């Protein structure tokens, strides 16, 4: 499988030896694919880039960068973990550990960020060598893309306050998203990084075309076809935004490039590409939370 061996550091406490045993089946993001790897390179302190422990924005950059790995067998002084992205399509069946949604017979899970739930959940912290493992959350793509747009919507209501968005009923699940007591004070302060991108690139996206189309269609086939689709749908909100708001080609054209790259990054940062797939055999195909699921490589 080319299972790369993560080296445990030198001697740890007996509860630290038992704690890493129950991580057998979590998701681990290795930066390079050397057959010998340290464990400090795996830990969340290796994700420190700008002199600070990152937010969910900085995690999604790092998660879109380095390479995923499922822990196969936990050994004394060694962790044997076969990475996902090596191998041909649909080879090397191995087990994930489920987290609260169902993870049905298919569904293409995404190894997505840990603070989408309770803040210090699953943060396996070794007291001996004093590091931190924040394992990510394996959710399927329509449940991935829904929730990551669901939490960024909530921050807008907190960014300037005056229905509860956080219901999201699943097939058997009444998904309690709200951890109201202490986490919503700490989950909202971590999407401070991701919200202000999502506000800007919309407001830089809308207000660019709100001053593009008045300055365009006035100097061919662009005018014919685009207005053919926006007959009283966008033109109805064109008169609505230009009146209930405010209204230079060279500032605009220099702002045309700047938005499009930044809007392009959010397509790679957000939207949560399917890393791996579930495709079961001799299995009940409806996975309990905390149950091992056979999981194979390519979407």
């Amino acid at each position: 499988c080319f299972e790369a061996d993560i080296a445990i550091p030198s001697g740890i406490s007996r509860p630290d030896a038992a704690a890493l045993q129950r991580c057998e089946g979590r998701v681990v993001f290795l930066p390079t694919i050397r057959r010998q790897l340290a464990l400090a390179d795996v830990a969340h302190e290796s994700f420190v880039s700008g002199g600070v422990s990152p937010d969910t924005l900085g995690l999604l950059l790092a998660y879109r960068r380095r390479f995923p790995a499922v822990i196969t067998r936990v050994l004394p002084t060694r962790i044997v973990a076969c990475p996902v992205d090596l191998g041909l399509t649909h080879a090397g069946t191995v087990n994930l550990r489920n987290t609260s949604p169902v993870d049905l017979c298919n569904g293409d899970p995404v190894s997505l960020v840990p603070p989408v739930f309770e803040g210090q959940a699953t943060d396996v912290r070794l007291e001996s060598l004093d590091l931190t493992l924040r394992f990510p959350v394996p959710l399927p793509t329509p449940l991935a893309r829904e929730i990551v747009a669901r939490l960024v919507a909530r921050g807008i209501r907190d960014l300037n306050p005056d229905p509860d968005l956080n219901v999201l009923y699943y097939n058997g699940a009444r998904l309690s998203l709200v951890a109201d007591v202490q986490q919503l004070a700490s989950v909202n302060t971590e999407l401070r990084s991701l919200v202000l991108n999502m506000v800007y690139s919309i407001t830089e996206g809308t207000t660019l075309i709100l001053t593009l189309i008045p300055r365009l269609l006035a100097l061919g086939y662009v005018n014919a076809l685009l207005q053919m689709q926006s007959v009283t749908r966008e033109a109805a909100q064109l008169i609505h935004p230009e009146a209930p708001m405010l209204m230079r080609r060279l500032p605009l054209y220099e702002a045309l490039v700047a938005w499009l790259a930044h809007a392009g990054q959010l397509g790679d940062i957000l939207a949560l590409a399917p890393a791996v797939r579930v495709c079961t055999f001799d299995g009940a195909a409806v996975v309990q939370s905390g149950d091992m699921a056979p999981v194979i490589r390519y979407p």
Partner: protein, 285 residues
């Protein structure tokens, strides 16, 4: 490692793999117990959000959670389901004759009312019923169906296509001449891609459905150039019609056929040599 297997225990109310063939594009039935809730959202409130609760509630009345969640809509089951929907008659009544004799047509009429109602409350039948595989075996009891129906890409039709020539092996029937819209009329020799396309149109023929396959040596990123063409249904005016998921690759261009052999005369297509590269859905505008 060019070999995989699936196995899922479902019911015989849908596909019923006894009367079906060894070659069957088994789609799923993703989340039946869902959609009172997301049928309410993802739509304006002037869409009568209790409609998928009732019409599928009639469909479950047409036959509790049980020891098997409701899965496996065949590709056979969908042809009759939009038989009155696509503009093709006397080639669509044959597959409906294959179902009402060998599968109850009340399960079709309750389902086609759901197909109008799914696109009515804007919760489409795509992002529902993801592809499942190719039906190697059907060990089905009276009530159950424990089908080995291998997923996982190219090998699933080659492992049912290498030993295919002797006796009767998979052959993967497209099951309709109206379906399998074999593209590249302006076409030459090359390995083609298979897709699974659902077209839509809001309030033209009242939230219409069309379930068929296209075959092209065109990329899924260049297919939207052709899927924006070739239709007159570009006049919704909201949006998001013409969804497609990649069925995979047909690396033998000559092997497409035209036949009429099933079971009732059902016009059909032999599709010799398939990569089942499972892909994902792609619906924006």
């Amino acid at each position: 490692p060019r070999y995989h297997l699936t196995r899922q225990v479902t019911l015989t109310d849908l596909c019923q793999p006894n009367a079906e063939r060894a070659g069957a594009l088994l789609l799923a039935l993703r989340h039946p117990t869902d959609l009172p809730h997301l049928a309410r959202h993802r739509a304006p409130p002037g869409r009568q959000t209790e409609r998928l609760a009732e019409a599928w509630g009639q469909l479950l009345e047409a036959s509790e959670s049980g020891c098997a969640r409701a899965g496996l809509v065949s590709f056979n089951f969908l042809v009759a389901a939009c038989a009155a929907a696509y503009d093709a008659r006397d080639a669509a009544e044959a597959v409906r004759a294959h179902i009402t004799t060998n599968y109850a047509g009340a399960r079709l009429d309750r389902f086609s009312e759901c197909l109008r109602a799914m696109v009515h409350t804007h919760v489409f039948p795509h992002e529902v019923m993801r592809f499942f595989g190719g039906l190697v075996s059907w060990v089905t009891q009276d009530e159950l169906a424990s089908v080995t129906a291998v997923c996982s890409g190219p090998q699933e039709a080659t492992h049912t296509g290498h030993p295919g020539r002797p006796r009767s092996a998979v052959t993967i029937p497209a099951c309709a001449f109206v379906d399998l819209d074999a593209e590249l009329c302006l076409g030459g020799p090359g390995a083609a891609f298979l897709y699974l396309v659902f077209t839509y149109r809001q309030c033209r023929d009242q939230e219409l459905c069309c379930v068929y396959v296209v075959k092209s040596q065109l990329p899924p990123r260049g297919l939207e150039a052709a899927l924006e063409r070739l239709f007159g249904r570009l006049r919704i005016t909201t949006c998001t019609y013409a969804a497609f998921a990649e069925l995979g690759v047909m690396p033998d261009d000559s092997p497409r056929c035209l036949h009429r052999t099933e079971r009732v005369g059902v016009p059909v297509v032999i599709l010799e040599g398939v990569v089942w590269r499972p892909g994902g859905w792609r619906a924006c505008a």
